[PDB]
Amino acid sequence: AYVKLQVAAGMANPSPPVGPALGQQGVNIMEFCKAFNATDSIEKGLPIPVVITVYADRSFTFVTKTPPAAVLLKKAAGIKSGSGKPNKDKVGKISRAQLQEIAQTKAADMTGADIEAMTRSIEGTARSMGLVV
Amino acid sequence: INPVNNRIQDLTERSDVLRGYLDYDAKKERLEEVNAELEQPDVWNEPERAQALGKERSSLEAVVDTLDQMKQGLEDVSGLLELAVEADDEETFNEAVAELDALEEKLAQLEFRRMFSGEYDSADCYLDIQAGSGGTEAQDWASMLERMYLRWAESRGFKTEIIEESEGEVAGIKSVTIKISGDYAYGWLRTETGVHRLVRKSPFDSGGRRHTSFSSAFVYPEVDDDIDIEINPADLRIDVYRTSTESAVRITHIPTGIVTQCQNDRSQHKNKDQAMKQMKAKLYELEMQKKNAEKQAMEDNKSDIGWGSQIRSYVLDDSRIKDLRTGVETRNTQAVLDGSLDQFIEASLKAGL
Amino acid sequence: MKVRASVKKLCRNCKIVKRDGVIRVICSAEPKHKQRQG
Amino acid sequence: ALNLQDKQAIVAEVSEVAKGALSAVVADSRGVTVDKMTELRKAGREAGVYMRVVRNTLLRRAVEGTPFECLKDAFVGPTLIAYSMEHPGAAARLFKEFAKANAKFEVKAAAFEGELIPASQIDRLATLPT
RNA sequence: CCAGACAGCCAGGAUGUUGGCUUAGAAGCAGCCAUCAUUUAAAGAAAGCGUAAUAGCUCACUGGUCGAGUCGGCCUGCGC
Ligand SMILES: [Mg+2]
Ligand SMILES: [Zn+2]
């Protein structure tokens, strides 16, 4: 039962948003919250995903990973929404140097050895976002 | 930077007024509760109550985080303004100006969503002033009230034109219907439905005895007169029978249950055409009766509230203006009757009355 | 079974078949597609 | 698609054999794209994009390109096999990582035949230059 | 199409990524916009089912087995 369901690391105890979605299983809500908070290592306020392999003994194994490139593009742009009709009117612009900086920060967990290929994947994500390089 | 200081003070004051009118802590309490029963998972085992919970959750959380981020914006803009006064960092001061404008516009959007919550609020309106059973004093009061409302409409920027104006023989106008056109006119003017209480030393009386006259302002939006759609062949039941050839045509509208017969003409087609015009006429009549019945039900409710229609009180003898619904008072009667009702209409619209 | 004068495949699991000179289509996916030329 | 792209594929297979005649095997009887993902991420971490798993082992694709070089693969061909061409070093460790993948669940399908670069047997050869 | 075709049969159908918004939730699958990149056997920001949304079940696609034809368009005669 491994489906990633998580919120930003700043808001501990996700009682409104996820809640029963992280707690169908017998693993406790408080256990999930303390495992998510155990967050404090790097930064808070940004969504940090995690793979949750739940066993029969309710001692789940969790493997954390890097924050999504979408909200990282948001932090690079400094804007909130950039998807509403981008072709009819361009909403934002990201530097390719900034995208390569994002790629070399994301080179840890992102599946790829070619940094330029991961970069051009990232401005693929950026054109899908709507912001034109 | 003095307009910036006054502007931050104005935002602080209007934010406090908004919190008082919105009752922030109570809505936060229901927000926390709705979050809690969302956390218990049976709420998604029932579909529709989760629908309602999602609606109320989104509304409460949006209002709560809006007021919270305006608190944070007020405090950090104040602190960074204190920085910008002494350190004189021009770019950081420009950043303060930009973020202050963004916060003001976003709280403006919040209070906007509250004050224009009506579905007909965006449309133009028909606003009517009618004097009471008093006489020429009520006539004069209706006329100068019409003057004041024209002055308010022109000051706001709404385009006015007098559709009808029934005057009195001595002075004043007995009744007047005005088209106020422009965006958000009905939303701006919808709190004016009700009664105004004039107390003044009457000039028309010979002895100078003071008079207590009344007038009503009644505003209603320009609803679209929708076209009356024709009736369906399946919705009709067509019969032919012998007239008293079976040229007689009995058309029956089945879903409502209304029949019309026609037998006077030898042509069955002529009989059917007259029956179809009778169908259309009765359908229009029934739609008008349904509309009038709904209007009568609304009138039953607002006649039930009754005395609550007395919304405004001008005591020109003692020179005080009073909104009883919001309870607010002022002393500048000449400014009020000039048309400076912005404070009163904003108070009423934030009250939601 | 739906009786139409123009029977055809509607979804990808629908199969034309001719039984007793009558063209039917049968559906192992959705019984709503079961229909008959008539 | 077409015999044209089949010809460039055959020429590519022959060219890859010639440039790197080092080889190893794998088989996907029960394996996941995440497993191939780990293998090809470590492969791109080792070296360039050129890592090719050329699973075209029909008796007249791979066996038809075979008589250029390493003619022993004709009997190897007609079964579920995925070859792998290698430059770096004589007898590199990619046969060994295919072995540890066999430990981590390719469910004993390739049977580690070894491609007989030193003309060896079907069994392991731990003696590799490191 | 004997550089093995069509249909069966054994396998995969991934990574950034849950592409964002607006929603209430939006994860290929409610709507809008863009419709890339990597691994490349191949995987569409997804063709369908499905979820409250996830989940899950397929498909396109490509690998393996088999070993002679395959497939659907046009003209036209007689028929249903
Ligand atoms: Mg016929
Ligand atoms: Zn069907």
Q: How far is CA D110 from CA D43, D72, D87, in A?
A: 19, 17, 21
* CA proximity to D28, closest of D91, D107, D115: D107
Alpha helices in D20-65 (DSSP H): 33-46, 62-65
Amino acid at B310: Q
Cα distances from B197 to residues B112, B158, B309, B335, B351, in angstroms, run 30, 26, 11, 17, 21
**Residue whose pair of structure tokens reads 């007609």 in the numeric block:** D78
Torsion of Cα atoms, B180 then B182 then B183 then B184, to 10°: -20
Tally of CA atoms within 13 A in the half-sphere of B33 that contains its CB? 7
- Chain pair A-B, CB pairs under 8 angstroms: 18
> What is the rounded CA–CA span in Å between residue D106 and residue D31?
5
Q: Note the helical H segments in B245-315.
A: 268-305
In angstroms, what separates the C-alpha of D44 from chain A's closest C-alpha? Answer: 6
* C1’ E34 / CA A127, Å: 6
Chains B and A are touching, with contact defined as 3 or more CB–CB pairs separated by less than 8 Å: yes
Q: Which of A11, A13, A15, A28 to mutate to test the interface with B (most CBs of B within 10 A)?
A: A15
How many other β-carbons are positioned within 10 Å of the β-carbon of residue A115? 14
- What Å distances lie between residue B114 and B20, B109, B198, B296, B344, CA to CA? 14, 9, 31, 28, 16
Residues of B265-283 as b/e, b for ≥16 C-beta within 10 angstroms?
A: beebeebbebbbebbeeeb
- What are the CA-CA distances from residue A26 to residues A56, A60, B133, D79 (Å)? 9, 10, 75, 46
Residue of B28, B30, B39, B68 to mutate, interface with A, max A Cβ within 10 Å: B39
Report CB contact under 8 Å: A113, D37: no
SS3 D43: helix
Q: What is the dihedral of CA B86, B89, B93, B94, to 10 degrees?
A: 160
Q: Give B211's DSSP letter.
A: E
Q: Which class for C33: exposed (0-12), middle (13-18), buried (19 or more C-beta within 10 A)? A: buried
Q: At what angle do helices A69-77 and A115-129 cross, to 10 degrees?
A: 80
Q: Which ligand is nearest to the CA of C35?
A: 2
Contact of A124 with chain D, judged by CB distance below 8 Å, is answered with no
Characterize B186-207 residue by residue with b for buried, 16 or more Cβ atoms within 10 angstroms of its Cβ, and e for exposed: bbbbbbbbbbbbbbbebeeeee
- Computed on alpha carbons and rounded to an integer, the radius of gyration of chain B in Å comes to 29
Q: How many angstroms is it from B227 CA to the middle of ligand 2?
A: 42
* Nucleotides in chain E near protein beta carbons (<7 Å): 1-4, 10-22, 24-25, 27, 32-43, 45, 52-55, 62-67, 80
Cβ contacts of D37 on chain A, cutoff 8 Å: 111
Secondary structure E strands in B168-257: 173-181, 194-201, 210-221, 236-241, 248-253
Cα distance between residue D90 and residue A26, in whole Å: 53
Both tokens of residue B155? 């000051």
Backbone angles phi, psi at D125, to 5 degrees: -135, 90
Distance set, CA B230 to CA B165, B227, B269, B271, C21 (Å): 37, 9, 18, 18, 46
Report helix, strand or coil for B335.
helix
Alpha carbons B67 and B292: distance in angstroms, whole number: 43
Beta-strand runs (E) in B96-139: 125-131
Residues A122, A128: Cα–Cα separation, whole Å: 10
Residue D128: other Cβ atoms inside 10 A = 14
Method of determination used here: cryo-EM
Q: How many residues does chain D have?
A: 130
Sign of CA dihedral B226, B227, B228, B232: negative
Are D110 and D27 spatial neighbours (Cβ–Cβ below 8 Å)?
A: yes
Query: Can you read off the two tokens belonging to residue A99?
Result: 């995208």
CA distance A122 to chain B (A): 30
Measured CA to CA, the distance from residue B78 to residue A42 in angstroms comes to 30
Cβ atoms of residues B253 and B171 within 8 Å: no
Tokens matching residue B202:
């009457």
Q: What residue has its CA nearest to the C1' of E35?
A: A128
- The answer to whether A114 contacts chain D (CB < 8 Å) is yes
| Contact indicator for A110, A72 with CB cutoff of 8 Å | no
**Through-space separation of residue D50 CA and nucleotide E42 C1' in angstroms:** 17
Residues D44, A111: C-beta atoms closer than 8 Å: no
CA distances from D44 to A31, A112, D13, D51 (A): 38, 8, 20, 8
Phi-psi domain of A106 (left: phi exceeds 0; alpha: psi -120 through 50; beta: other): alpha
Tokens of B154: 């022109």
Q: How far does CA B126 lie from the centroid of its chain?
A: 12
* Chain A nearest CA to D36, separation (Å): 12
- What whole-number distance in Å separates Cα of residue A77 and Cα of residue A80? 8
| Nearest-angstrom CA–CA distance, B322 and B339 | 15
**Contact: A19, B38; criterion CB under 8 Å:** yes
User: C-alpha distances in angstroms, D23 versus B43, D15, D38, D117?
Assistant: 59, 14, 19, 7
Site from A2, A63, A109, A111 to mutate, D interface, most D CB atoms within 10 angstroms: A111
Report yes or no: D123 and D50 within 8 Å, Cβ to Cβ: no
Whether the CB of A25 is below 8 Å from some CB of chain B: the reply is no
Among chain B residues, the shortest Cα distance to A23 is held by B41
CA angle D58, D59, D63 (to 5 degrees): 100
Answer whether A72's CB lies under 8 Å from A42's CB.
no
Sign of CA dihedral B283, B287, B292, B294: positive
D37 vs A: CB within 8 A: yes
Q: What is the distance between the alpha carbons of residues B345 and B352, in angstroms, rounded to a whole number?
A: 10
Do residues C34 and C26 lie in contact, with contact meaning Cβ atoms separated by under 8 Å? yes
One DSSP character per residue, B14-36 reads HHHHHHHHHTHHHHHHHHHHHHH
Q: Alpha-carbon distance B99 to B81, whole Å?
A: 11
Cβ distance C23 to C34 under 8 Å? no
Whole-angstrom Cα distance, residue A36 to residue A11? 10
Q: What is the DSSP letter of A19?
A: G
A102's tokens: 């994002």
Residue whose pair of structure tokens reads 């770019």 in the numeric block: B91
What the block records as the tokens of B64 is: 């709560």
Contact A77, A102 (CB under 8 A): no
Residue B120 burial by CB count (10 A; 0-12/13-18/19+): exposed, middle or buried? middle
Q: Identify which ligand lies nearest to the alpha carbon of C29.
A: 2
Asked whether B215 and B141 are in contact (CB, 8 A), the reply is yes
The DSSP code sequence of B26-95 is HHHHHHHHHHHHHHSGGGGTSHHHHHHHHHHHHHHHHHHHHHHHHHHHHHHHHHHHHHHHHH--HHHHHH
Cβ count within 10 A of residue B104:
19
Structure tokens that stand for B15 in this block: 């934010």
Test D41 with A114 for CB contact under 8 angstroms: no
In degrees, rounded to 5, the angle at the alpha carbon of residue B85 between the alpha carbons of residues B81 and B86 is 125
Enumerate the β-bridge partners of residue B108: none
Q: Which chain D residue has the Cα nearest residue A112?
A: D41
d(CA B48, CA B46): 6
Structure-token pair, residue B166: 């029934």
Residues of chain A with C-beta less than 8 angstroms from the C-beta of D32: none
The residue of chain A nearest to residue D47, with distances taken between CA atoms, is: A113
Neighbours, chain C (3 or more CB pairs < 8 A): none
Task: Give distance in angstroms: CA of C20 to centre of ligand 1.
Answer: 17
What's the 3-state SS for chain C?
A: CEEECCCCCCCCCEEEEEECCEEEEEECCCHHHCEEEC
Neighbours of B290 (CB within 10 A): 10
Per DSSP, the residues of A60-111 read: -EEEE-PPPHHHHHHHHHT-S---SSTTTS---B--HHHHHHHHHHTTTTSS
Nearest CA in chain A to B53: A16
3-state secondary structure of D127: coil
Region class of B255: left (phi > 0), else alpha (psi between -120 and 50), else beta: alpha
**Residue A20 is nearest to which of B35, B44, B57, comparing CB atoms?**
B44
Q: Does D49 touch chain A (CB under 8 A)?
A: yes
DSSP letter for B226, please: -
Shortest Cα–Cα distance, A130 to chain B (Å): 23
- B86: number of Cβ within 10 Å: 7
C and B touching (3 or more beta-carbon pairs closer than 8 Å): no
Q: Which one, of D99, D96, D126, D124, lies nearest residue D110 by Cα?
A: D99
Position of tokens 């042509």? Answer: B267
CA distances from B326 to A36, B5, B115, B307 (A): 49, 29, 15, 15
Q: What resolution, expressed in A, was reported for this entry?
A: 3.5
Cα C4 to ligand 1 centre (Å): 16
